[PDB]
Ligand binder design. Structure first.
Ligand SMILES: [Zn+2]
Ligand SMILES: [Zn+2]
Ligand SMILES: [Zn+2]
Lengths: 1069, 49
């Protein structure tokens, strides 16, 4: 290619031909380049020739329009680059907004940029962004690898490696203790292929910048995937052991007791050993991991061999903590066993590192132990400190005592008995799992436990019109518990006495509305709480009973049903009796009827205050302090919590300030001090280390001064009674589970009882699939709360709650695996009442125009009247997208693959035309019509021809293009199904985004802010702040209030339980 | 923002001067964003309105 114009003097700013000499057919163009991607808007295009380099100014009249299109491409590319410089870690949806809202100069012939443009210019843009990374050189992550960029590279059929042009770190505010943990770990565990070959990077020979981007992306992508099932982890200390040679072993003193066996307090084994000392045992090599145990007891069996009982300890390395643990720290476990005194090697020193009298105010050699580790649930807890009675002062093993309680709690025992018939022994009450079951109480059971009274082909598609429909093809939630009232408990007999194993129950069946002939229509407006009575009867084993619940007659009530139903858990009600056969509803029979401390709370990374809100609902807290850097969130939080001091400064600074004696910040707000904060919650972001592969120099650096580290410092300084760290599920797998392991380690060094668990929001009454990692911690003194049992039955695929750490399976105390008391909350329940709006709705306050339809709706709107509906506002999508939405059908499951290949007038002059199918798809074949299905030369196996690339099509060119390798982009331009749920927590809904189905089920628009808020379980009264996307962001970052309440109510039990223990010990004092 | 554009060499703190002072009077070498806090001897002339 040759060129011509007026060459000017390098300094000459003038773009007129004035002080210039004219050239023609200027030597073939070697290279062309660019520069200006950093400082100001100095994006200079430059040509390179074997003679010289030229910096282009302005183009000729005739060349203006050709250079015109070149210029747009470039400007967009600048925007993307500068944006990513400032916002790595940005998500697809963030660009699209960045681009869309960037106002281009009049210098550019275009009015504004759209998603369509970006897609049209994807190849150029991406290629440009790749170039910038070679060009300026950091150790920092290449821009082309940010999520937005990988999302684009995948969506747009971008091939990588096409080359071109060129031209103090965060310090976390730690505590002494915390710092050392992450410092020592760096000071310890730290150490140290197959490209694509085909790419233009790979075809180029310490010089090396031959890093394959196709590889680089796979890697980056792979690094965001985890491993979700493996057996329960084998118990420790069941290996062989080595026995030492007998010289002089003999009792010392007089027998402590006698039981066929006789116990002593002291033994000689060359030196002395006493009941309560600790010994070490050596196993059959295998690995050489020295075995320590506490000598529980000592005795001589009837056979005259000398025995001791060994309550094993657990090495820190062997707890979840693994490598991170103090090599000298040991943990108590429910592992003990009888041995011959012959197996002991040496007596060992084991010191109990108990907490101080003012452990709370304490923020900033030999074997020791601190906590009782439960292998299976991964709970570190405060040692039982039950004391030895004189009847077992000699035999005293905590492991044996726990296991005992645990065996008799599990045990099905009978409390009161009545008459007997045949071999059946009728009773009035019994127990299981720590629960008492008396006659006339009600009961939960699996769906299989009993039964009710039951009830009793497509035609061809116009493919010229719906060409992509062929792509449409290449388990659901359980039923909640059955509920019955107990009538007879007749048991069985094991000869002399009752058969505790064969306890049986005769029950009156209840129907739920949708067990009725109503079925799916019972379920809509109905209270999820409500049942119907039935004289239908059943018999099932006690074994199958899942729990007790409270079914009560509506009219037999001294309060409002609402009042009753909100009063506590597992409370149901009936008003009418169903009848299987007459299928009518009559009144029921006559035989069917008859303070809490709020913790003072600092919510770090508070957002608009969802987590705080669910904890407010539970009654267990009062958030007096919040820290949120992003003003709009802060603003919103304030609006919802007037009593809270809401700091908007960086938490690192606010901490340094308290650690310096400051009573107040700049604005003169009240800084919290030691003792103020009873509970500390928060969701620290995991910015530059949230990936699964091993730690690096790079990755650790980030995490070491992360907000996780800062948050843990808050916990160390303030030493709260309780603690909670919320985060995305995959928190527990980041960096080969080290982020979790170090977090736990740091909590243990501090001396906290702590644990972790994964929780599916949808299981607590929200129409959404979203799992969160939850890290609980409770101070010594309090009790470590449990994770809450699912209240809602939910799709098992969603509920993968387990967590593998160092190929060992760690599960939470949650027992409801699958079923639960209440039905699933649907998108319908979530938003079916809200008045119709249209694309681009902006009126914030509007009348409801109608009553609440679903239970759920009734609950988020309040048991009263409220006129205004706030934030039912949705994004003003481009006329193109708006058209697409309009053309997405309403049948459940419809998405872009249902679009018609049609011309459409796009409001204004613009006309979205048909997709041209000009290539063979060799994998996908022809249409029913014999038509081609390929959109790009890559469908044929060739490299992509560009300009074979279409834009502003109603069926987006780029979806067929990359379809086969991305699963047909199933769910893109997809409508939420009334019966379904939110694919995730939505922060900025984009139809070709990564946040799931976001179209409304019926309306040719995307979901509103309020609709999202409803997906999150926010009261309609709850307020948000700032422009629409700020609000969208707010809702979607939040922890859903119903999840927070659930967890909140588990803390309720620890408090109540821990308050009634100081009161049963104030009497004994 | 504007000042920066005109003086690239300048460290432009946007925090409250009262806080930036308390920070130097406490030994801090840098602020939150990790910018370079000035210490005794750095500053030859001090202007302002
Ligand atoms: Zn390659
Ligand atoms: Zn024992
Ligand atoms: Zn292609």
């Amino acid at each position: 290619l040759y060129f011509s114009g007026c060459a000017k003097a390098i300094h000459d700013e003038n773009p007129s031909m004035e002080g210039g000499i004219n050239g023609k057919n200027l030597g073939p163009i070697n290279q062309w380049w660019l520069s200006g991607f950093d400082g100001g808007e100095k994006v200079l295009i430059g040509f390179s020739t074997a003679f010289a380099e030229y910096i282009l100014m302005e183009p000729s009249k005739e060349y203006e329009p050709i250079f015109g299109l070149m210029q747009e491409k470039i400007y967009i590319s600048k925007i993307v680059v500068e944006f990513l410089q400032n916002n790595p870690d940005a998500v697809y949806e963030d660009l699209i907004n960045k681009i869309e809202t960037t106002v281009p100069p009049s210098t550019i012939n275009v009015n504004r940029f759209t998603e369509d443009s970006l897609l049209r210019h994807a190849q150029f843009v991406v290629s440009q962004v790749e170039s910038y990374d070679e060009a300026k050189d950091d150790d920092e992550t290449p821009i082309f690898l940010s999520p937005c960029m990988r999302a684009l590279i995948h969506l747009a059929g971008v091939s990588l490696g096409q080359r071109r042009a060129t031209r103090a770190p965060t310090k976390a505010t730690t505590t002494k203790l915390v710092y050392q943990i992450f410092d020592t770990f760096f000071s310890e565990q730290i150490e140290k292929r197959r490209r694509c070959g085909v790419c233009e990077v790979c075809q180029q020979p310490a010089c090396l910048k031959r890093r394959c981007p196709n590889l680089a992306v796979k890697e980056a992508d792979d690094d965001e995937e985890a491993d979700d099932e493996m057996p329960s982890p084998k118990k420790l200390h069941q290996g062989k052991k080595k026995k030492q040679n007998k010289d002089r072993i003999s009792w010392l003193g007089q027998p402590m007791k006698i039981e066929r066996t006789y116990y002593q307090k002291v033994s000689i084994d060359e030196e002395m050993l006493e009941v309560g000392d600790c010994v070490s045992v050596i196993p059959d090599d295998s690995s050489k991991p020295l075995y320590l145990a506490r000598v529980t007891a000592l005795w001589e069996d009837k056979n005259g061999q000398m025995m001791f009982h060994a309550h094993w300890f657990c090495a820190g390395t062997d707890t979840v903590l693994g490598a991170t643990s103090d090599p000298l720290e040991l943990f108590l476990v429910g592992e003990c066993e009888n041995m011959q005194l012959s197996y002991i090697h040496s007596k060992v020193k084991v010191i109990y590192k108990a907490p101080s009298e003012n452990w709370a105010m304490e923020g900033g050699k030999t074997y020791f132990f601190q906590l009782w580790y439960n292998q299976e649930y991964a709970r570190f807890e405060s040692p039982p400190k039950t004391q030895p009675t004189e009847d077992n002062k000699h035999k005293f093993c905590l492991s044996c005592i726990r296991l005992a309680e645990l065996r008799q709690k599990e045990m099905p025992k009978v409390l009161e008995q009545i008459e007997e018939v045949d071999g059946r022994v009728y009773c009035s009450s019994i127990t299981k799992n720590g629960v008492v079951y008396r006659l006339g109480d009600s009961v939960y059971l699996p769906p299989e436990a009993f039964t009710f009274n039951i009830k009793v082909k497509k035609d061809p598609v116009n493919e010229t019109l719906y060409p992509e429909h062929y792509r449409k093809y290449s388990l659901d939630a359980p039923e909640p518990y059955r509920i019955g009232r107990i009538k007879e408990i007749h048991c069985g007999k094991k000869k002399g006495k009752v058969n505790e194993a064969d306890i049986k129950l005769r029950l009156y069946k209840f129907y739920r509305p949708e067990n009725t002939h109503r079925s799916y229509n019972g379920s809509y407006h109905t209270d999820i709480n409500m049942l119907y009575w039935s004289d239908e009867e059943a018999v099932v084993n006690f074994s199958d009973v899942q729990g007790r619940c409270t079914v009560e007659y509506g009219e037999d009530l001294l309060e409002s049903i609402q009042d009753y139903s909100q009063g506590g858990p597992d409370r149901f009600y009936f008003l009418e009796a169903y009848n299987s056969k007459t299928k009518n509803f009559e009144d029921p029979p006559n035989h069917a009827r008859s303070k809490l401390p709020k913790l003072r709370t600092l919510d770090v990374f508070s957002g608009c205050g969802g987590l705080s809100e669910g904890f407010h609902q539970a009654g267990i807290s009062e958030t007096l302090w919040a820290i949120e850097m992003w003003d709009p969130a802060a603003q919103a939080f304030r609006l919802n919590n007037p009593g809270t001091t809401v700091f908007t400064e960086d938490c690192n600074v606010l901490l340094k300030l308290v650690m310096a004696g400051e009573v107040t910040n700049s604005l003169g707000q009240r800084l919290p001090q030691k003792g103020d904060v009873e509970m500390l919650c928060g969701g620290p972001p995991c910015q530059g280390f949230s990936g699964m592969n091993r730690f690096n120099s790079r990755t650790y650096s980030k995490f070491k001064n992360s907000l996780v580290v800062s948050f843990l410092s808050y916990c160390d300084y303030y030493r709260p009674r309780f603690f909670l760290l919320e985060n995305v599920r995959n928190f527990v797998s980041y960096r080969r589970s080290m982020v979790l392991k170090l977090t736990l380690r740091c909590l243990v060094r501090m001396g906290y009882q702590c644990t972790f668990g994964v929780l599916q929001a949808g299981q607590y009454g929200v129409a959404q699939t979203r799992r969160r990692a939850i890290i609980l911690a409770a101070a010594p003194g309090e009790k470590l709360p449990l994770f809450p049992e699912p209240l809602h039955v939910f799709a098992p695929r969603a509920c993968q709650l387990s967590v593998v750490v160092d190929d060992k399976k760690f599960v939470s105390n949650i027992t409801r695996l699958s079923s639960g008391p209440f039905r699933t909350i649907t998108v319908r329940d979530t938003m079916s009442d809200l008045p119709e709006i249209q694309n681009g709705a902006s009126n914030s306050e509007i009348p409801y125009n109608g009553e609440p339809l679903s239970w759920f709706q009734r609950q988020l709107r309040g048991s009263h009247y409220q006129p205004i509906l706030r934030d039912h506002i949705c994004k003003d999508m481009s006329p193109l997208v708006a058209a697409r939405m309009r053309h997405i059908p309403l049948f459940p499951g419809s998405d872009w693959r249902d679009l018609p290949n049609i011309q459409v007038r796009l409001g204004d002059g613009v006309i979205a035309h048909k997709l041209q199918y000009t290539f063979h798809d060799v994998k996908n074949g022809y249409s029913s019509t014999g038509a081609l299905r390929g959109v790009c030369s890559c469908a044929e196996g060739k490299a992509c021809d560009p300009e074979s690339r279409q834009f502003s099509t109603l069926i987006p060119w780029c979806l067929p293009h990359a379809g086969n390798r991305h699963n047909h982009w199933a769910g893109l331009y997809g409508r939420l199904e009334w019966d379904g749920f939110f694919s995730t927590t939505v922060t900025n809904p984009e139809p070709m985004g990564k946040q799931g189905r976001v179209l409304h089920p019926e309306q040719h628009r995307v979901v509103s802010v309020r609709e999202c808020a409803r997906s999150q379980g926010f009261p309609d009264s709850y307020r948000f702040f700032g422009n629409i996307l700020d609000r969208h962001r707010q809702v979607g970052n939040a922890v859903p209030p119903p999840l927070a309440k659930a967890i909140g109510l588990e803390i309720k039990l620890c408090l109540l339980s821990s308050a009634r223990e100081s009161a049963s010990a104030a009497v004994k004092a």
